[model samples]
Target: FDYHRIDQKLLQNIVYDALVWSTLNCLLVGDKSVQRSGRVPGVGLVHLPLSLLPGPFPESHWKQGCELAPIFNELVDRVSLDGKFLQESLDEFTSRLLDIHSKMLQINKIRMGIVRSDYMIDEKTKSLLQIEMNTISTSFALIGCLMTGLHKSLLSQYGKFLGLNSNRVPANNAVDQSAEALAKAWSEYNNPRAAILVVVQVEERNMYEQHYISALLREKHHIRSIRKTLTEIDQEGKILPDGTLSVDGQAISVVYFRAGYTPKDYPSESEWRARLLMEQSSAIKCPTISYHLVGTKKIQQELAKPGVLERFVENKDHIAKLRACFAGLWSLEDSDIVKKAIENPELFVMKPQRGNNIYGDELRETLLKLQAAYILMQRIFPATSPAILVRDGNWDTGHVISEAGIFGTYLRNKDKIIINNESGYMVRTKISSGVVDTVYLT
Candidate 1:
């Protein structure tokens, strides 16, 4: 769809309407320019950057993403159960976490996972390819649902003029789905007085996305939730003789981490202490340390290797389905792969076990540095389309590429699988020039 063909005056009117709808619907995020925006909720709010309309995505590919969610969730759970595999695959801070997982082995408690599997539609093959699986701190579910709402409203009003159909925009229930999963996990804890503890960063600009789930827990499920930083938990947290995780005299039933994924989240020993303390508790962790390890880039590479997936997953059909989406992944140990990457750095992305992607000259330089804590992945080229991006109430029409992330929620109590299903999806569309990352819909 070519948005540029539309009259400038008409586009301006649409943009104005989109901005107003976003503000009225609370499609807001904490503004980084304003002091205390990250620290204080409801202060210095700004509308989240988003697409003016839903972008076109293949129906079959969208269905493929939904189908893969539960399968990926199951894969994560299966991989997490193997302690030897995780211990062999990871290190350092991860080693400390492994120690925690080893200690928790004897304690049979419930495990809940809120995962997001990201994918890109390849320009060459016109197929959905797996980017990564995020097993912790999966943000944007609530905001994504809001974007769908915004786009659907815009389409319904302007579809006839634009020659687009509103019904083609897929329905999203991400907010409700996430809340229901959290509420279900809370009930599994079997404690009426116990609260769900949301582990957050000290300063979070994306706090509203998290707040939506908490608000729903209280309003719809009648379940209480408390938000705390790792340091705060370190100061206030305690484990009782009964193995209960208590903070400021309140018992915690579920520990949903929105932080603790990166080293930056643990600036001091206090934060590490808090993480270890929580892992030792009886409360169900959304991702037990093992599940967290399974989502690592190193593990992703290792699982992509021949015969490795077969170790955890027994079904050949399931294995084939999982492997179908995997982009080329190699360990730094592969001298052949390393040499090829050095020769053609632009064709590959070098990624550390944790953190951002390194590409082009940086990929070559880092490879030359001789790294083991990194993995090499085949770079994917996604299809681009016409898009109208809005940020801070300003609109610009440009060619953009989008990635979709399907949210999957898994809950297991001992051998019994309680809730294992695809929760919902979020689409992130960025300019082809790669300027901004914003939510949109299929």
Candidate 2:
């Protein structure tokens, strides 16, 4: 369909209705223009930039994504358990985390993982390819679900005229699924009086997304939770004689991280002290330090090497399923791959084990200047389709690429697995020129 050919009056009405629905349903984000918004949760608010309509996605790729979630979750857990692999894979700020993880291994406490594995459908082969697995602070569950509602409502109201089908939009339960997972983990803590602690960045624009899960935990599960930054935790946190984590006289049963992923989150020694303090406690951490390490690009590159998956995963089929989604990943040590990448710089991306990615001419420059810290990955070319994108109350039509991220939750009490499944999903679509989650229909 040529979006430009659509009646302007109808498109205007759709945009107006979308903005109204978004505001009414609390599909909002912090407006950085307002000084206090990011630092203070509810002050300055704006609706999230979203696609006015759901983008087209293949049913086969969607199913493949959901099936891969649990397998990837289990893989993260298994890789996290192997302390030796983590130590050997990456070599910084990491040493401190590793030190904490090494000490915690002696206790062998219960583990909980909230993971998001992102993928793009390769335009050439039409195969779903794994981008990266996020083991910590996996976000967008709430807003993603809300976007589905926005699109569903728009499609139902205007389907016939637009030649679209409302039934094609998938139902999203990301908020509920996330709440269930957190509630289950809280229950396993076996402390009715204990509150779940959510560690966050000082100034966060995505507070509402985090708030939705906390709200459900409180209202539906009847569990209490508190939000604090690492600085606050460092000042108020302590370990009881029995190893319980206490913050401001409140016992914490679970420490769910929404911050502490990047180096910027740790400006000084206070944040690191707070992290170490949390790691030392008996409270179950969602990713734990080892799980955190497994998500690093270095570990990802190592796992992609031939026969590496066999080290942690025993099931043949599970191994095959995971191997199938992996994109070409090579460490700097692979001189041949590096030579090939330099020859055709645009064909690859250079990424450090943890932060920003280098592309195009910069990739070649970075690879030459610093050879040891980064890994080379094949840049994915994803299929694009026309989309009506809404931003800051304005709507425009353009070709966009969408990335699907399937959320997976894993819970374990020592050896017994309590929950391991694809909990929910998120789909993020950006203009084709831009770079960047899932909705599935059977």
Candidate 3:
């Protein structure tokens, strides 16, 4: 159907059906509607802006992403092994973490560390460029797959009328794949009686999205998952002599942290204590603290430095493939990069390791004091893709640029690799740029 033929009422009905389908199927975030009250706070998701193109997905880029995973994994593990590098790279403000770092280092066994390597197609070059690698709390698999379903359904039902082939938009099973990965980790822990502990935020609106993973763990794999906060962990969780984390008399085989990524998550000293306790426990940390540290912007900057990756990765071919994915990363301490950033400020994005703050000459001055704490990274300007986007009110029109993020889930024990695979992929299109957006299956 032509755009003119698709009336307002039908469009509204289609969107309404999609939202209802998502919510009822546990594709949504919480117990309540985002627009409603007297229910669990819900995560917001955009419904409009369906992609007109099946995909602008590049096969070469997808191949590059696949080749880069184990190499990236090896690099992360090497960085995590070096405690001095992580400590020296952090600034004074983040000094408090050193104590927790010491505690994490004492733990002998480290389980699986999951990673989501995000990539974007260069607007002009059309080559895949890595945006960042998330090591801990790498979310969005559940909701992203649902969004893919939504788009697929829309394109399937209406594509012929609208000049699209629904087949072009590939199917995604990110949620199912992620649950399978978690279940595999739980089994590796070798305790059928133990549960997978999901360390979550106290009042999370995105609860349902997480619940779906837990539900699948039970339904598909017969594994149990328990969700709790750091504070609750402090009050209810006890460390056993065998180094297991036991809560309510159930042994925790895996500690999957969804919290403890931000400063607010550690509002009290007790929360820090709780984190240290979990660090020492025998359960597998979805991200061991070292894995968490290596994911920092600073570490990423270090990896981008000339000849740095070669020090950790000996394989020449792997180095070349891994190196190809990086965007330029610079430290404020590096005078040449600083001069370049000053000469062309728009070319760089000032990223602080610990917080989300803006940039200025004064911010540069602030960085001088926070040495190794800030990264001046090259900013990417993505190319716009043709799409119908929903705006502030009603059926307002605009265009969206799409950025693709590939999901990689791997499980590894010390000195061994059990599973290393590029699990799935997701694409998010924004009405504007760089703000929160939803992924399309395409």
Candidate 4:
């Protein structure tokens, strides 16, 4: 096998074969001359990359360039070329498909208030889900994309399903002209006029995450929110009459907190003093509670322990959504059509919620990884390159043996994920080892 004994041209062929076999994924999705899958866009991409050269793969090196067709023709001639392997793979995936679909339906049902209808399959499903998601290292990239997209589509069609986005009051000048009415009404009976001020972090990470509510407040309702910062306030966190925000000169009536929760908010004891000063003001808190609770692992765990959904949800609709998201129990290896959809996204990419490093690299790498690094396309490419696959994931994927001693906690190391859908793309990088997530049923 030592190439040094052979001509330099022969060495090139061996190197070329390594390149070919290593990049078969791209050959499928990137190349169009072979075939495209009708089942799923990504699946089609997977097949298209390898069929490039026409039949009769030149076993020997040819001076002319190659087309995948001939390579494939030769591949089958050299191997069993059976259809059974493909069929079996599909069959295995189908079993996983059922699990993913079930949970998805339940999550949607609850988030959209659809549980009271005949659509719910069971009465106890909702209660059980709250408990499952708490401790479960769900697929962050895949399921999160599906949930967000589903929520968005539902809202676009039905308009605000879970009161999830209902935060502020209207801002129209005519509607907000309540100060005059409020003064008279307060003199007669009682009620205060309120304007809300939104405090924001200068370099916050999730400004867009809250856009759903902010957009509606601005356009449809014509409401205006005054933005400021903790440091903008004086030492007492005091808002003097002149310091109050104004459309003209009148002060805003409400104070909304979008920042100041991080460590930076109170660097020292003196910082907490300023917050206390704000607390003494007349403004009301928008959330009255922290939005971060939704991200708490403790809350997630508490909900997963059982009978948790009923605590926060009053309607059957909310219950259904929770149940749907919680009911799945399959792994990424499944072969069901819909599950395959998760494996292959026409909608979006996905990643494990808590795991990372399922590849040979880390999260900071780029499109340099090839099979371990790729850009997902929304559609099939019939020309140029094969389907590119980017296996961007991080999981403490470890294992053990029997005779010497095997089997520990490698499977439990499922906490991170990496995937691409079509539109939005991410730079190639290695996954880290903190929170674990994975593509799963429940």
Q: Where in model 1 is the C-alpha error above 4 Å?
A: 91-96, 102-109, 331-377, 434-442
- Candidates 1 and 3, the one with greater lDDT: 1
Candidate 3 regions off by >4 Å?
1-17, 30-55, 91-93, 106-110, 331-377, 390-395, 433-442
The residue ranges of model 2 lying beyond 4 angstroms of the native Cα positions read 1-4, 103-109, 331-379, 434-442
Minimal lDDT window, size 10, model 4: 110-119
TM-score of 3: 0.82
Model 2, residue 171: C-alpha shift (Å)? 1.7
Q: What is the lDDT of residue 208 in candidate 4?
A: 32
- As for TM-score, the candidate ahead, 1 or 3, is 1
Per-residue accuracy of model 1 over 1-442 as CA lDDT, tens digit each? 6777788898899889988987898888788799899998879988888877766787887888888888898899999988778878774777666667777675645888999999888875677899889999888888777877887788888989888877777777877888888898889989999999999999998888788889999999999999999999999999999989998778999999999888789888899899989998888888889899898877887888666877888778778778778787776555546787787777788666567788888776655567433667777888888887888878888898888878998898889998888887788888887222323335
The sequence of per-residue lDDT tens digits that candidate 2 reaches over residues 134-243 is 99999888877887787788878988887887777777787788888888999998999999999999999889988888899999999989999999999999998998
CA lDDT, candidate 1, residue 422: 87
Q: Tell me the tens digit of each residue's lDDT in model 4 across 190-259.
A: 1133334556554433233223233444554444445455565433244557444342233444444556
User: RMSD, model 2, all Cα superposed?
Assistant: 3.6
Candidate 2, residue 375: the lDDT equals: 67
- Model with the higher lDDT, candidate 3 or 4: 3
Error of 4 at 369 (Å): 41
